[PDB]
Symmetry: C3
Subunit: 335 residues, 3 copies
């Protein structure tokens, strides 16, 4: 079947954007070809210069989001340049068999491999590195992203009515485990290998030092805030490959949410806060009705405000007093 | 639209009670007016005299539950008396825009403000303080409660059949972060400000010292147990503004549960244990069939029994041997 | 009603197997009689000889799975031999009243008791020990298992179509709290009582030392891997009596999942990772389509790989290249 289908090649884009794609499509199934190149690198993850000996797909945390339609085949070329130190692989939660592909994509530095799998189920699915004996370290060091498999006729509400988004953003949340020295300051390592032993000790405490969206505290704030306008519906894809999170839009809602991320199930409506299980990706739609700067955050507020799991969305448009009005501004208590 | 509606004024009551209200109603939309007054105070939170430098809406943890119907407007006057030290605000998860209202309700000591918003979605929603730069501290120190927005035609099961409750109770669960001194004993602070730095250090460990319902270990036990009778349906509203919890009724069930708390979604039935995401409120209905003293608790049993996240419900009525019978009482093993 | 029904006696089997039973049945309700005998024992829980002063139903962690049909009565004889040191009891989450039965099954060493209850709701339900004042310790030391109450007409999908399994396995996941000495090595205790105080201190940190399936690191690996074949549908019952978990089948899916474990609710389809709330049991069906050795694990990968929460399923059959194909094996990057 796959050998008789047309092929297409998709160029990936850096998070938090998602590569252009159709939602409902008249196209039949295709072999959709992607390539990713692993990059190990030291990254600065907070405002006080703390560094992570990181590992990435395509130079970014998260890796890029791959979008296909249900019934397509994903054909990924995974490249591990000779400038990297470690072996890598890929486990697609959207794929059937061979440990998600990991058994077939074991690439040492200087190697590449090509895997094909049928994307037979709709949803947002995590992909991550999974090299034998080193899985949690590679994942928490940054090697995860999302595969979104759209239903061929687009998204649907619980009664089967059409849903859509006008803009998509992808948020990868990363629980980091940065070791400290005897002085209480975070350790800086010269090489990736030297970070291993100390990092495993922090991991085993189950207590992250930092929890960041898209690779660093404040990654999605200031000039790098997400953007939208009143009337626009945004899709927020949220992946967490290792630890639970509870997304929330301050002053908004999840109008329609697939917290388990699987589009053949009916979504829930009107959520204040939703739940992404560690090892999954979920998806929320929201149509903005008020302008302003929103926060999109993990609603364990310590994780958000102290540890880093928060971003901003700057929304243009006209304020609606029907929805919310300041009746009396802060003023002295009448006596 | 809102400017042409009638106004009503509601008098709030202290948890765990909820102010009188209708479920299904023939009334049209109203502007429903509430007032809350912030009180900072030192509170004793356990049986060994540990104290929390607390911050409250209306003197209680949680704050009172506010009940309206879908399509009503909530009009809250938030008062911050000059006897308090800190600025405060309110973020309603049920409200659209301006960071849930927080941008419009920033009150220094000696000030008050009035906010109106349309309650356009049914469910139980958390409200909490959210002052710039101090959000997690205010929330974990006690500044949260629930807004319940009932569907105008009352609660419905998945097939659209009517559901009801005869009595409602509101439970706010609070993960507390009380610092210790070099002797291993909990610290007592003279003022709220002096507790800040040490508390933030405990918060960042993500490990609560205590987890309490309604402000203290044992708050909902003894003379202050919740009460019901065989045949009565109770609504248990459970809010957790910062951390996940897993409610459970020992010897009972969640007959119908909205764990994400949003009434336009179908509830689940027959739950043993349900899940309240940090930053949300959920709702369970149960119709008692046996008398006795039940426990209602967070089913991480360490959190419940060691840290404080448990209460009691004392139920009157007639024992049903069909449902459960002691066939043979404890007795020596036959030999 | 119960006094006029026929009785049946079921012989329990050791996890991960489940005793033979019917799914859809033409039988009417019965009194189904079971017996369990508590065994306290020291168990080796990891590969470096760490020991747990354990407490078990029937000598195993978890206890055996009990299977009945909705409307049956469960009649359990709980025996606490005089060779044990502690009092015990049983709390069935499937039972109504008397703290799940615990008030009626309080057995000192040398005693036994018989409890009957109506299994009026379908689902997988946790049962655990719950002795007054000692509940969390008994639970985390190993005293939990699953009662599965099948609908009398078998499992159903969201449209009411029949679902089935060909094989069932039961996985109990146990968060353990093993104390350490001043040398940093795990403590070995001569008796169960001597482990108590130190264990409670570890419990209160909320950080498990180990998290194991079925009593030990690697319990469900090697010769003790679960088994299946391509085309077979397996039911995976997963219980966690104290702490949340997030099951995942690497290279598979939860085809149909009741994550809250209650069969009268519609299942979700196509899950990558699902969520078992602490204090509950859930159920997933999967039909294997590829052969190979799968991992079934908690997808907090630190919990799985570092702490022990992972097992294997070895699947026989023919590889399907349509579903997944290695297009290009690992090879040097072309230059
Ligand atoms: Cu890797
Ligand atoms: Cu405040
Ligand atoms: Cu026991
Ligand atoms: Zn081809
Ligand atoms: Zn649109
Ligand atoms: Zn995975
Ligand atoms: Zn008016
Ligand atoms: Zn009633
Ligand atoms: Zn909030
Ligand atoms: Zn009989
Ligand atoms: Zn079959
Ligand atoms: Zn229980």
């Amino acid at each position: 079947d796959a050998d008789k289908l047309p092929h297409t090649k998709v160029t990936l884009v850096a998070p938090p954007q998602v590569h252009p794609h159709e939602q409902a499509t008249k196209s039949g199934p295709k072999v959709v070809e992607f390539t990713m190149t692993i990059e190990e690198k030291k990254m600065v993850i907070d405002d006080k210069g703390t560094t992570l000996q990181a590992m990435t797909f395509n130079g970014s945390m998260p890796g890029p989001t791959l979008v296909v339609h249900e019934g397509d085949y994903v054909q990924l070329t995974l490249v591990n340049p000779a400038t990297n130190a470690m072996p890598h692989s890929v486990d697609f939660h959207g794929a059937t068999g061979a440990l998600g592909g990991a058994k077939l994509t074991n690439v040492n530095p200087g190697e590449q491999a090509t895997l094909r799998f049928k994307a037979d189920r709709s949803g947002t699915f995590v992909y991550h590195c999974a090299p034998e004996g080193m899985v949690p370290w590679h994942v928490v060091s940054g090697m995860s992203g999302t595969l979104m498999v759209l239903p061929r006729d687009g998204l649907k509400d619980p009664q089967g009515k059409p849903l859509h988004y006008d803009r998509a953003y992808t948020i990868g949340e990363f629980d980091l485990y940065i070791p400290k020295g005897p002085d209480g300051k975070y350790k800086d390592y010269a090489t990736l290998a030297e970070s291993y032993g100390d990092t495993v000790q922090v991991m085993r405490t189950l207590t992250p030092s930092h929890i960041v969206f898209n690779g660093k505290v404040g990654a999605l704030t200031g000039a790098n805030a997400l953007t939208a306008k009143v009337g626009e519906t945004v899709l927020l894809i949220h992946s967490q490959a290792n630890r639970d999170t509870r997304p929330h839009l301050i002053g908004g809602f999840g109008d329609w949410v697939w917290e388990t991320g699987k589009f053949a199930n009916p979504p829930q409506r009107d959520l204040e806060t939703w739940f992404i299980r560690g090892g999954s990706a979920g998806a929320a739609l929201y149509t903005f009705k008020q302008p302003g700067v929103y926060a999109y955050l993990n609603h364990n507020l310590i994780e958000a405000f102290e540890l880093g799991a928060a971003g901003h969305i700057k929304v243009e448009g006209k304020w609606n007093d029907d929805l919310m009005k300041q009746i009396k501004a802060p003023a002295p208590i009448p006596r």
